[PDB]
């Protein structure tokens, strides 16, 4: 189970980034890069992420139904509480953060269009 796995990868894993004594996750699927069981979605039976996808917000999801078939264990879906509505569809507790990342993904996307355009 995940209770056991997390207690295995907790002291070390590819994803733990214990730098300067600070501990952030390199995990693709973590939302706030906080090395926590709530978030370590690579580990969780179910998981949700709200990364950008070329201007578009992307909301990768991982219902457990796929089980252990990594090639297809994760299911993307491109797309502001609506994204949170999708993420809660799989992980209800992740949603409050999944909304707030999903926003900050938007301000980043707006901020960089301002920056990428200003780089001209």
């Amino acid at each position: 189970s995940t209770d056991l796995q997390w207690l295995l990868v907790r002291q070390n894993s590819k994803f733990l980034q214990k730098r300067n004594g600070i501990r952030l996750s390199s995990d693709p699927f973590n939302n706030n890069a906080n090395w926590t069981k709530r978030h370590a979605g690579f580990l969780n039976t179910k998981a949700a992420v709200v990364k950008t996808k070329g201007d578009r917000i992307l909301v990768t999801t991982k219902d457990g139904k796929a089980g252990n078939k990594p090639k297809s264990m994760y299911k993307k879906a491109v797309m502001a509480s609506v994204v949170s509505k999708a993420v809660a569809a799989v992980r209800p507790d992740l949603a409050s953060i999944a909304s707030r990342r999903a926003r900050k993904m938007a301000s980043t996307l707006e901020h960089m269009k301002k920056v990428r355009a200003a780089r001209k």
């Binding site: 600070i22 390199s26 706030n32 890069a33 900050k104 980043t108």
Partner: protein, 113 residues
């Protein structure tokens, strides 16, 4: 607002060029410093611990977090008001061009950009 801003220097580092300024706890019964006579240097102790919610916080207000490449920046994407990437000293000026125009696009702070 720090307890002590001074280093806790080793006793008599100033007389002996070889001694590093780095702290060693004094020993010897007769050490003026461990017997803690009032005119002497101080020793570090738990009481000089910094306030614990302002601890590790650089004057920028960010906690520094080491960064080595452009992928690390996303470790700070969602907590960019809490952590500030400090790019490692040995990343190339090459790669730093890439970390920096990307640390700009993401709104993450960098200590040495």
């Amino acid at each position: 607002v720090k307890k002590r801003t001074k280093r806790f220097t080793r006793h008599k580092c100033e007389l002996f060029p070889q001694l590093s300024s780095s702290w060693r706890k004094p020993r010897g019964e007769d050490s003026p410093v461990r017997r803690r006579y009032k005119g002497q240097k101080a020793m570090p102790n738990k009481g000089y611990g910094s306030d614990r919610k302002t601890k590790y916080i650089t004057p920028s207000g960010f906690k520094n977090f080491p960064i080595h490449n452009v992928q690390d920046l996303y470790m700070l994407l969602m907590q960019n008001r809490k952590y500030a990437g400090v790019i490692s000293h040995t990343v190339g000026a090459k790669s730093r061009k890439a970390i920096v125009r990307k640390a700009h696009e993401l709104d993450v702070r960098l200590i040495n950009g």
